Every structure is written in C-alpha cells, then in structure tokens.
C-alpha cells in the first residue's frame, strides 16, 4: 500500500495524493475525489497491464469501487503539476510493506485526448522508466530516477508498482504540464449550490486590507446559475470582463480561461494587491427542518432482556436522520440512521447493545438532502434497576 | 481569513483545519466537513462573542453556510489532539491581512457534555489565553503562549479572532484530549456503504508481510451492515472478540471502544504485528448506467445566429447527468447537468458561447445516485464556415 508523494525529491504527486495532501509549493487540493480521499494508499487493482490489468476507462481507479472518481478525464478536472523532459526523480510513500516485482512508468502519446477517459490508446504501451523490485520487500520510502520522454502541454504519467506475491498492482496517475506578471492568490472553488436571489463575490485585499473599490459581484438570478460549475464560471468570466489588476481561469497557454469548476485567481504584479477570498450572500429562505422524537420514556428498569428504546420520528423537510444512544461513559450501545421524507412518520425500535444503571443520552442529528448538518437534539433518559 | 495550525509551534490544529490538512504525526484527517473542508480560512461570523455573536449550536460554525457540518457535537464524531495542561502554544495561519484587535482562548468547562450541541454553558467564559492585536495587520503566521488549565479527558477550546474594521470574527474550535504498550496501526474509516453479499476485512502485516492469519472478515448480511458507521463498528467489535493481539476503537480511558464512526486500530508491542490495512470484497457486479446521446450531427454549418446543439438524452439507471463541449484549444463553451430518472428521455439544446470552425467535442458524464462516476463517452464535431 502506498502512494506517489513529493515529500523528499519527488517531482510531482499522484492525482489520489492531492486527493488527500496539498501541492509542494501551490498548495493546491484535488476536488470531490469521494472516498479514496481518505486511503490515497489503496488504489490497487489487478496486475498484469496493458495486456490484462485494469480495463480502459477504469486506469485511473484501478476498478477499485472507493477510486470512482478519478476515472472522470477532462482538460480541467485536475491539477497538473510543472515538469519537464529528461531526468527526473519519482518517489512513492508505503503505508504498508509488500514484496515488490517491479515499478513501471507509462505516459500518454502526443495524440493523446484529454478529454476522453484514459486507455491503452492513450498511453504508449512501451515504459519510460522501469525499476527491478528484485521480488524483495522495498524501504518506506522510494526514489526512482526516470528519463521523461519530450512533450508539450497536459500529459499523464500512470505510474505501477507491481507486487510479487499476490496478483495485484497498484496504479497512480499523475497529472502534469510541461514546462508571469500574474501571481496567483486566491481561487473560487465550486463547492456548493446556491439559490436564486443568492450573490457570490470577491473580496480583494490590498496593502491596507480588504477593498470594496476592487470587488466583484455576481447576482445569481436563474435557475442555471445556482449550479457550483456554473457560477464559478461566470464569476470568473466577469472578473476577466470588468478588472484591469485581476484575472480569473486555468492558464491554457497565455491565456486565463474560465472553466466550469475551479476557477484559480491572480493578480497583477505591481498592482499592490495581496489575495482574493469568496464570500457569500444569501437573501434566501431558511428552509425549516425539523425531527420530532416521541417514545422516549425517562426511565428504564433492566430486566432480563435487552432493553429496547421503541420511538416515533416525524420529519419536516427532505433529510437523513441519525440516532445514537450513549450511556454515561461515552460507550455507543446503538445507532440507526435512514433517509426520510418531507412529513415522514417512521417507527423504529433500538436495541442496546448493553444494559447498566445510570444516565444515558439519544442524540439525534437531522441532515439536508445534500447532507450538513441543520440540527442536533440530545434527550436524557435513566436505565434503573 | 485564516484557522488554527501546527505547522511550526502550534500545540493543536483546530477542527476545520484537519478536514483540508492531515494531523501532525498521525496524519489523521476530519471526515465529511463538507463544503469549508476546501476553504478552512473561512470559519467568519459576527463578532461580540460572548454577549453577542454566533448562537448556541453553531458556534463552531460561526453560523457559516460553508460550515455547518461543524456543528455535530458527539463523543466520537471529531480527530481528537492530545494535549497537556500548563504552558502551550497555540498557531494561526493566515490566508488573508486584516487588521486584529485580540485574539481569546477559551475552554470547555469540566462538566460539559460532549453530546449536546456547543453552546456558551459549556464554555468558560472567562478566557484562559487573551492577545492583543493592536488594530494593526498580524504577520502570516503568529504564534501565542498561553496557559492551559487543569483538565481530563475531551475538551473543546474555542479560539476567536476579532478583526478590528468589520463587525465579524473569526472562530475555530478545536477537539484535545488531555494525557502504552498498544501501538498504533491503521484505521478503519467509514467512507463508503456497502452491499449484503459484501464483505470488509483486515490485512494485518508484520515482518514478512501481509500475514493472512490474522485477518479479521466482516459479513455485510444486513440491511444494517451496509451503512458505512454500523460496518466500521461493526468490523471493530468483531477485532476486539477474536484477536488477542489487536484491538480497535477510540481510546476511552484505558478501553478500545468500538464507535459508529472513524475506529483507529492497535496492534500489542511485541507481537510482531506492524500495520494494518482494510479491504474489501464486492460481490454485486451491476449496474450499468448509460445515458444514449442523440443527435449530435458530424458538422455545423456557422453561422449568423449562435450555433445550437439540438440533442436528445436517453438514460439508464438512477443519474445525474453532465455534459460539456469543449473546443479544440479545451475551452469550454457549453455545460449543462440535471437528474434523470432511470429510462428517462430529455431534448434538450445547448448553445455554443462562440462559433468558430473547427474540431469540437461533447462530453458526458453520468454519476449514480450516490454521487458514484458510472460512465464517460465523449463525441467529436466539427465546426465549419
């Protein structure tokens, strides 16, 4: 288990990495990588590429169902990392310790389409780089020193780390650029919904603080804007129509271009201008949620079987619901979680894993259908002998 | 704009800080903060605390739409940071320059409940750590000495910063634990739901590698198993009840207590035993989601109006549906996405932002109900004058 990292020479980190950890010197993240963000170690798949291994369109994952999200490929999903041809030094992190085969290093032809998802196709099927393994169990940390073939622009690198003794690989792509005036600082990431009558907008500081004079505004006045992708783009876009210090978009060539999605921001060297932050406002309407908890009993007597909470929830609003009891020590003895509809009325019975004297709490937690936090309601109750 | 750190002296990372950076030395992370986990600078609310303020219940939030994850308030649910009473410093980054007039310490009080929702009783509203700001700009990292006073077991400290030219502050709690033969090993982290038919297991390593005698297989049989907290609890217990050299659950005392939520696992010094890894067999092959694309001529004639993609959309399966058309050069010039029931048709018509001839492509993304990437296909056109 492990990961291609820049913490001591590596010259560029994993697209799973960035899931997980900043970018050496940038500081950037990837976005919405879903659950793999939190094992960036696990993306093992089948060995044997290209001729078995893992299937195209499913490169990147290496079918593993917790990556399904690095599969996605377009010229602006990920951040890409500066490199250039010739020697250059890769570096994988282990969390775990596994006899090695080998470590091959694959990249993408110059006809490769960055739009299309990764495939034999768009590599060539012949490695860079290859390092033996030696069927031998590797240090914690590795460092392979590779020849990077001549290339222009977005190119991807997929690195594999075979291992000796199971029939398993691990696969990390790695999203880089071959190798002014605009300094970047700040960015509109798209990270969550608006509604209309909402505006996003910048918050521009100069030498002496924050400045209004500098500011950007976009109402959200249609039904298309309230999509994250779709305002970030538009802000962006507006920012390069109305500023003269500011610019806004992924750099393609010698140009600032809005995407839809994250949209990085610069400013313009001598202008005295620091950093771009986003605030938000909103006009709009506090949905009301709500979820009623009746059936609780202020004591319970310990009998000779386990005792049982027996409850009705009623929701107001579209949500999930989240139920744990919790005796006195900070132990869980249940939980129980479920969607519910707007006026649903559900009844449920929890089991508690273990009966002693004393005082215990049911915290109930209501979640919106896009899933924050609107509420938590914690009741008291008492199991007696 | 900034957040509590430990990048050079800081004690104890603040809480919205570990859902973007993993934790000092165990590289734990918070999980499932949503949207503020890209924007940790941004935890802004209105100043005054504590007369004034963020309300009961979302002070951890500062009220922040960003942030409102924050607010769940269990025994479990939060990365906790160990920490000793006496001198400690605490560290702020700043990500953007405002004029400060103090920044206040404060902690829980030593009867508060770490099940309810954070509210001014909990606290100690007398602050134990206050820095004068001056009403002048702070460098981008500060640094305070403060004196942390006698407690056990969790705690909750509240670190305000109150910016001096607006009516706002900004508030980061932070989780701390205050302070042997078990070490620590891997985590069991509740990312994703599972299938009945499933199963979720360990690969416990030790010197020769992965060792398959000390593996511990979870069952999903049950509706109930297949919720992400109730297998990782689940899984946990089922390691305490078999395993003589392996525990896992947060440390309650001088117990490994099983939570419905993130379970840490321990391994006994001494037996061999290094790290552990989890995995997971997936038996259910399906589905196949597919959203059929109709329409999309080879060639589009420019042009005295705007060029429109007349199309229809057929879907497979539960989805949201994505799609963008990105020119030769990869700017995107259309983008549109909404949910389609499974078998639904949509005619829909895209309008180019520009038209000039050329290679074009359309791109479609399907995710699944749960947010899951299902498919890619891409189709190339042609602009023409």
Same mark, same amino acid.
């Given at each position: *288990? ?95 310790? *596994? ?71 691990? #696969? ?78 992924? !750099? ?13 921001? #610069? !400013? ?42 027996? !409850? ?13 009891? #919790? ?31 004393? *005082? *215990? ?25």
């Amino acid at each position: *288990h492990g990961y291609v990292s820049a913490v001591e020479n590596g010259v560029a980190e994993g697209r799973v990495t960035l899931c997980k950890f900043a970018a050496n010197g940038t500081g950037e993240k990837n976005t919405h990588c879903g659950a793999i963000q939190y094992e960036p170690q696990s993306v093992e798949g089948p060995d044997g590429f290209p001729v078995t291994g893992p299937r195209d369109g499913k490169i990147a994952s290496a079918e593993s169902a917790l990556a399904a999200a690095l599969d996605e490929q377009t010229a602006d999903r990920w951040v890409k990392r500066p490199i250039q041809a010739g020697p250059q030094t890769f570096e994988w992190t282990f969390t775990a310790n *596994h006899v090695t085969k080998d470590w091959k290093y694959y990249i993408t032809k110059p006809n490769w389409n960055p739009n299309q998802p990764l495939s034999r196709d768009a590599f060539d099927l012949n490695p860079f780089c290859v390092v033996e393994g030696n069927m031998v169990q590797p240090p914690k940390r590795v460092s392979h020193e590779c020849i990077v073939p001549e290339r222009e622009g977005y190119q991807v690198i997929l690195a594999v780390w075979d291992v000796g003794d199971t029939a398993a690989s691990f #696969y990390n792509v790695i999203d880089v650029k071959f190798d002014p005036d605009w300094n970047p600082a700040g960015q509109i990431i798209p990270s969550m919904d608006l509604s209309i009558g909402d505006t996003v907008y910048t918050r521009v500081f100069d030498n002496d603080g924050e400045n209004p004079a500098y500011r950007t505004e976009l109402k959200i006045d249609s039904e298309t804007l309230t999509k994250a992708n779709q305002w970030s783009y538009a802000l962006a876009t507006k920012i390069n129509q109305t500023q003269k210090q500011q610019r806004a978009g992924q !750099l393609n060539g010698d140009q600032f271009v809005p995407v839809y999605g994250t949209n990085p921001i #610069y !400013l313009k060297e001598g202008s005295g201008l620091k950093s771009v932050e986003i605030g938000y406002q909103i006009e709009a309407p506090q949905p009301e949620y709500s979820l009623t908890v009746s059936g609780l009993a202020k004591e319970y007597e310990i009998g000779e079987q386990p005792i049982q909470l027996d !409850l009705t929830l009623e929701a107001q609003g579209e949500m999930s619901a989240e139920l744990t009891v #919790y005796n006195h020590h900070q132990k869980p003895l249940a939980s129980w979680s479920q969607a519910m509809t707007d006026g649903e009325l559900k009844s449920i019975t929890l089991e508690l894993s273990e009966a002693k004297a004393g *005082h *215990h709490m049911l915290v109930s937690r209501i979640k919106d259908r896009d899933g924050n936090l609107q509420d938590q309601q914690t009741l008291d109750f008492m199991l007696v002998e």
